[PDB]
Design a binder for these strands. Structure first.
Length: 1298
RNA sequence: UACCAGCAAAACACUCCGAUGUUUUAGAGCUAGAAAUAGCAAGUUAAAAUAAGGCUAGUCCGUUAUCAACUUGAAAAAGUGGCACCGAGUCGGUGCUU
DNA sequence: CTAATCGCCAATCGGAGTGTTTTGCTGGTAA
DNA sequence: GATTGGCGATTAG
């Protein structure tokens, strides 16, 4: 009978229903409603269009901030509960005036002065402490009684902003000098390693280690003055420890265990104690010193003040910024006043000129201010001392800038500690509540506990030991913390698939290693002169290999098996041819062999391994093994806490040793352990029919959930639901008969670039960025991008290149494009000429490799797999098997998601079960790629262009169907790679390349094609092409747009100043927008058509109205709860309840002459028509834009004047735009001088005026055309409304002109 | 179609923390002139909010995913739209079963 | 009044940890 | 990351 062909995409789905001999049937349908139409005739071909889906990141980024905004507010509430009783005797309303600051004077109840409460005290206070840091510095260094309000202000400011948590441990801000250190350091090296002393080389390491440089540059500068040292040397290792690195101390100390040390993690003490155990304490304070330096050079960019003067080095360094601004301002003012009197009106008085007034009051950043002020400073005389600071970004700085994110939280704690001790003698209540204020600052919830819910949330997993409120002071006596870190990991671990409801084993377990190691050794073969055939391996040999090779090295080399076993035991000179890592570590740690050999002591090691794999913190691990103590000794635990594993395997425990061969002895694990006659692997054991595993394993094992459970981007998983629903709708139409076949085909920046080029320039030391400054919208071109990635140097020649020479240069792929079709950065290079690459059919010549190995290694630059392909010239090159495989992949759909879709369709299509516990096929599912159809179109001249209409979406499904059905029925044995279910390479390559040669005539073939057994008629080259041509030109395709309701944010997020309009929305309930401001950009969900009456004039003339109203996202619930009261509050009277109609977005209307419009909102409209240009002009337009066909293009030239007539005629009755059409005609009238190629390229641009969708702007040869927005939804109130189904064949029409 | 092995490339889902930006109020502008108008002097900081709001009253939740119209249904969804030809103005016609 | 065109605007920058597929040279092995 | 619907000022009825 019939067949179906589909085509899935990210914004469209196409379908078609072919028949016996490649024809599309037509049918009569029924139309409902109250209109005059009672029937219609339609063809079975169409398409569907929809929008794109999004991801869940933008919602998480706000969910994880709503919680912080409310957790920060509770920190201040705790501080006010300790100060209330004492403050209730000084000022009764101090805490009340602090909450009504954001209030106009009329709405205030108390006075308008917050802190003190008079006009003569506020001014005095503001005249003594211009900034908050003056008070902070005064409180620490003074020894007098202070008012309570100032103490509260300082503490609140310190607590609100607290700093970052990146360094673990305790800081110490006393050592600011750097050189006492390089001295102190060397001092010790040669205080025990004397006679052989590293040379101090009078190194003034001051600028070497203190300059604002990177770690690598400081490393190169350190040993520059020392005559010869090693980057990997132990002095270098301890130096790298001083900076931020991860040195290893195994070298030069003949160690066997890795000794990676980090100075910022919270494990340094234990690792240092362990490392000082195998060497001793003779070399001790060579470390207490490396510490001092480590902290002495990271506190060098924020603290720039001296010592032995103050105990507050951060507050004292923010007064230098204040005192170096008031001094430069006067000088600049005087200099501008004297030598340039005509400009002292916009630098200091205009708020929209990026001067000094537009930098303090208006909106402007430091960069814009500097860029604006540089010429003015340059022109006049003097101003030497000010031009230098501008190059250091230290001209006129502010104390709250964007670069304050490098301040640790251990500095704010010291000032608070210092303040709390000077004033603990006058106020006794500060002596008791002193350990709580320090705890409010440093508390932080662990990342494996989550929200503190009470069983009313969806993202929570935490348990509780006692029903009580959780506070920072009792967090350890309420939260269990023991089972909270186990449910964090076990809620994401995979389940088994051969036996569900079972958890998988750890990767590094003991049973799992037994299974993995011995399974591999069950099949191996070796040949010697004495032996006759390649024999297998026995269990004893495997045990010996494990004992001698596995237990001496985790990885067992094949050479070790060849030499240590064969040569020593079997006496074999030559022969031809997994890790028990846990066992050797346990042997080294426990130091008891018979303990591990004993098989009674089980259910113990598995628990130990699970404990080590599961938790991460140290107290957790200790307490878990606390019950597992008293058995070995005290010493083993200290080393057991230091071991950690990672990884989860995929196999259950009961599957291995719970349903094993209890009826035959040898376990599933032991079957692969001590093999016998039946050397059968696990796959043979499961997949055979001789044992009783199958019954037990097979005893165990909605559409939306299944589809949502797949793997892939959300944007593609939207096109499968629609495909399934379209299929189910199409089956019903054709009489509830299932299709014979189904053919499916699934058709498939700048900031990264400037980040990459900036990193490359910074690491390479190149100065070309200063030479050629680049903005944010320049280097999107690949040629200049590649030019800058190489520091402007050729890579095939070793010469410097030019910024405007790449134009005449070339871009070439590393691997030739004839083998790999790659167009990414990893495959493209820029060169003066491709001939310098060497061979044109292989990897570049070895001369280039030898001459550029150094620069390829330098490109450590992270700018560029590319190195491997470039260096392949020395590795012998490529093969042909990969070419054959890729040729097969070019037409065989090997992607997994297509297999998922095919399985989903096949499972629901076939349901009848065979009586022999099997299934019978009724519908075939075929998958194929797009190469075949493209080749067919190119060969048989069915050209297509994509910028006329959307009909081309539905013209590919028909071609897929015809090609697939024709091909599958001619070769009855190629179903292996084309149907779902279940030397030579060159022959397969040729066969798959020439598959599609049965359509053509000469490479002469008969007109009639027959197939084997019956001479089946599969093609007839006298009428089939005529049918295809007739179908490809039909002015009837069902295009349908999907209607959706809108959701998302309420409006725009920008806050606007006060105004006197009625379009502003209040931010809170009691804040009038005419005195505080608000947002104004509401988003409409859907519209409603109401017919009612409203009063007019003072006489209340009850006129009758019928209009459209918009319902925003913000007020949906109020409307959906009671529409009548909502409408009455809006201002309408006597609302007719039975005539309210909802209208979602993208609704369809019908005007007088077939003119249709969509609905984008309650104020605008869209276009809803299509163009049907004949099939001759498509071929002419495709040929003109690019042998004998040139002559044909030349003879037929008047076609350029027939397209314009059709465009004008179509636009004069549907589009209804006059000025744009007149401009287009006038522009076309005077440009008939250029040849056909460019005129065709510009005629193709004219199809933007008649394109379905929103209006847009296009451009002709020179002229630019603007938009033609429609802004009146008043005419549509007397038209017809159309409701359509998913395919569009079923529809109803309602007349709104009643 | 599954299990071990080296690395690399990624993509997706959840939890815990930093620094800015924007909007109102406080930091007493002065000298001449009835008046617009001129002349001069300062400018760097702090408090509150950050989707309107909810009931289950928690140091909890609020921007992803699903959605043609009528008849019945709490809900999901069971029931609901007759076949072939020619011409080829968007469909029309004829001949009958219907 | 009063309704229709024209020109400009739209929140952004860093860090730490855990779990899972899918592709590309490696394979092997096996049903 | 551009698109595509909102709002103020001007201008034509």
């Amino acid at each position: 009978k019939y067949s179906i062909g589909l085509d899935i995409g990210t914004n469209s789905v196409g379908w078609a229903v072919i028949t016996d001999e490649y024809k599309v049937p037509s049918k009569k349908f029924k139309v409902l409603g109250n209109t005059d139409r009672h029937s219609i005739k339609k063809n079975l071909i169409g398409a569907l269009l929809f929008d794109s889906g999004e991801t869940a990141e933008a919602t998480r980024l706000k969910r994880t901030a709503r919680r912080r905004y409310t957790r920060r507010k509770n920190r201040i509430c705790y501080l006010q509960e300790i100060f209330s009783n004492e403050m209730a005797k000084v000022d009764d309303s101090f805490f009340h005036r602090l909450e009504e600051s954001f209030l106009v004077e009329e709405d205030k109840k108390h006075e308008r002065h917050p802190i003190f409460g008079n006009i003569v005290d506020e001014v005095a206070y503001h005249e003594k402490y211009p900034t908050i840091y003056h008070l902070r510095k005064k409180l620490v260094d003074s020894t007098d009684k202070a008012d309570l309000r100032l103490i509260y202000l300082a503490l609140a400011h310190m607590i609100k902003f607290r700093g970052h948590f990146l360094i673990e441990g305790d800081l110490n801000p006393d050592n600011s000098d750097v050189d006492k250190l390089f001295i102190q350091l060397v001092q010790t090296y040669n205080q025990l390693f004397e006679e052989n002393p590293i040379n101090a080389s009078g190194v003034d390491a001051k600028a070497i280690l203190s300059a604002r440089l990177s770690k690598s540059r400081r490393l190169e500068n350190l040993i520059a003055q020392l005559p010869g040292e090693k980057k990997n040397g132990l002095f270098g290792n301890l130096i790298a420890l001083s900076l931020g690195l991860t040195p290893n101390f195994k070298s030069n100390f003949d160690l066997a265990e890795d000794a990676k040390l980090q100075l910022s993690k919270d494990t340094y003490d234990d690792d240092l104690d362990n490392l000082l155990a195998q060497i001793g304490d003779q070399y001790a304070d060579l470390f207490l010193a490396a510490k001092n330096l480590s902290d002495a050079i990271l506190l060098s960019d924020i603290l720039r003040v001296n010592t032995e003067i103050t105990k507050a080095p951060l507050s004292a360094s923010m007064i230098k910024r204040y005192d170096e601004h008031h001094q430069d301002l006067t000088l600049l003012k005087a200099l501008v006043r004297q030598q340039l009197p005509e400009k002292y009106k916009e630098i200091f008085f205009d708020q929209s000129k990026n001067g000094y007034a537009g930098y303090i009051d208006g909106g402007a950043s430091q960069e814009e201010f500097y860029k604006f002020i540089k010429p003015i400073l340059e022109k006049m005389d003097g101003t030497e001392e000010l031009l230098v600071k501008l190059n250091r970004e230290d001209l006129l700085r502010k104390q709250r800038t964007f670069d304050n994110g490098s301040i640790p939280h251990q500095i704010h704690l010291g000032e608070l500690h210092a303040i709390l001790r000077r004033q603990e003698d006058f106020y006794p209540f500060l002596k008791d509540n002193r350990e709580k204020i320090e705890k409010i600052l440093t508390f932080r919830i662990p990342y494996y506990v989550g929200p503190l819910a009470r069983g009313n949330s969806r993202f929570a997993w935490m348990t509780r030991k006692s029903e009580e409120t959780i506070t920072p002071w009792n967090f350890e006596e309420v939260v269990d913390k023991g089972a909270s870190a186990q449910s964090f990991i076990e809620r994401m671990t995979n389940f088994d698939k051969n036996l569900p409801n079972e958890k998988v084993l750890p990767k590094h377990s003991l049973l799992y290693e037994y299974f993995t190691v011995y399974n591999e050794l069950t099949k191996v073969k070796y040949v010697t002169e004495g032996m006759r055939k390649p024999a297998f391996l026995s269990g004893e040999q495997k045990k010996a290999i494990v004992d001698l090779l596995f237990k001496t090295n985790r990885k067992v080399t094949v050479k070790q098996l060849k030499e240590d076993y064969f040569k020593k035991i079997e006496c074999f000179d030559s022969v031809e041819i997994a890790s028990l890592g846990t066992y050797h570590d346990l042997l080294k740690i426990i130091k008891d062999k018979d303990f591990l050999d004993n098989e009674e002591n089980e259910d113990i090691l598995e628990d130990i391994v699970l404990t080590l794999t599961l938790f991460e913190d140290r107290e957790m691990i200790e307490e878990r093994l606390k019950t597992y103590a008293h058995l070995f000794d005290d010493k083993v635990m200290k080393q057991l806490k230091r071991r950690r594993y990672t990884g989860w395997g995929r196999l259950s425990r009961k599957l291995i040793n719970g349903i094993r061969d209890k009826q035959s002895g040898k376990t599933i694990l032991d079957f692969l352990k001590s093999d016998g006659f039946a050397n059968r692997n696990f796959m043979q054991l499961i997949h055979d029919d001789s044992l009783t595993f199958k019954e037990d394993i097979q005893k165990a094992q909605s559409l939306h959930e299944h589809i949502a459970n797949l793997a892939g981007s959300p944007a593609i998983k939207k096109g499968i639901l629609q495909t399934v629903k379209v299929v189910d709708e199409l089956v019903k139409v054709m009489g509830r008969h299932k299709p014979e076949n189904i053919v499916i085909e699934m058709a498939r920046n700048s900031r990264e670039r400037m980040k990459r080029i900036e990193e490359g320039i910074k690491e390479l030391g190149s100065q070309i960025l200063k030479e050629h400054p680049v903005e944010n919208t320049q280097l999107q071109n690949e040629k200049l991008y590649l030019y800058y990635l190489q520091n402007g140097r050729d890579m095939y020649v070793d010469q410097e290149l030019d910024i405007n020479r790449l134009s005449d240069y070339d871009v070439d792929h590393i691997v030739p494009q004839s083998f790999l079709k790659d167009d990414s950065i990893d495959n493209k290079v820029l060169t003066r000429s491709d001939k310098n690459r060497g061979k044109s059919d292989n990897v570049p010549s070895e001369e280039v490799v030898k001459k550029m190995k150094n620069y390829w290694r330098q490109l450590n630059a992270k700018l560029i797999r590319k190195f491997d392909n470039l260096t392949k010239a020395e590795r012998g090159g490529l093969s042909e098997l990969d070419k054959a495989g890729f040729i097969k992949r070019q037409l065989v759909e090997t992607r997994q998601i297509t297999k998922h879709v095919a399985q989903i369709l096949d499972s629901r299509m076939n349901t009848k079960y065979d009586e022999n516990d099997k299934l019978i096929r009724e519908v075939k599912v075929i998958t194929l790629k797009s190469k075949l159809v493209s080749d067919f179109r190119k060969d048989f001249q069915f050209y297509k262009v994509r910028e006329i209409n959307n009909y081309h979406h539905a013209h590919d499904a028909y071609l897929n169907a015809v090609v697939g059905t024709a091909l599958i029925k001619k070769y009855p044995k190629l179903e292996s790679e084309f149907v779902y279910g279940d030397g030579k390479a060159t022959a397969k390559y040729f066969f798959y390349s020439n598959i599609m040669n049965f359509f053509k005539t000469e490479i002469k073939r008969p007109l009639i094609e027959t197939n084997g057994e019956t001479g089946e008629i599969v093609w007839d080259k006298g009428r089939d092409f005529a049918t295809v041509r007739k179908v490809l030109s039909m002015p009837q395709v069902n295009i349908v747009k999907k209607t959706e309701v809108q959701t998302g944010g309420f409006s725009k997020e920008s806050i606007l100043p006060k105004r006197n309009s009625d379009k502003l929305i209040a931010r809170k309930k009691d804040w009038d927008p005419k005195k505080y401001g608000g947002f104004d950009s509401p988003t409409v969900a859907y519209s409603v058509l109401v017919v009612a009456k409203v009063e007019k004039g003072k006489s209340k003339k009850l006129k009758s109205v019928k209009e459209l109203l918009g319902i925003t996202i913000m007020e949906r619930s109020s409307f959906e709860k009671n529409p009548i009261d909502f409408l009455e509050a809006k201002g309408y009277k006597e609302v007719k309840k039975d005539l309210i109609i909802k209208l979602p977005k993208y609704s369809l209307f019908e005007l007088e002459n077939g003119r249709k419009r969509m609905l984008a909102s309650a104020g605008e409209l869209q276009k809803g028509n299509e163009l049907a240009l004949p099939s001759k002009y498509v071929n002419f337009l495709y040929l003109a834009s690019h042998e004998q066909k040139q002559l044909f293009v030349e003879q037929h030239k008047h076609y350029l004047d027939e397209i314009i007539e059709q465009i004008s005629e179509f636009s004069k009755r549907v589009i209804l735009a006059d000025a744009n059409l007149d401009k287009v005609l006038s522009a076309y009238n005077k440009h008939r001088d250029k040849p056909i190629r460019e005129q065709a390229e510009n005629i193709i641009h004219l199809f933007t005026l008649t394109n379905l969708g929103a209006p847009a702007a296009f451009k002709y040869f020179d002229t630019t055309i603007d938009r033609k927005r429609y802004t009146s939804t008043k005419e549509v109130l007397d038209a017809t409304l159309i409701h359509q189904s998913i395919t569009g064949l079923y529809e109803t029409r309602i007349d709104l002109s009643q």
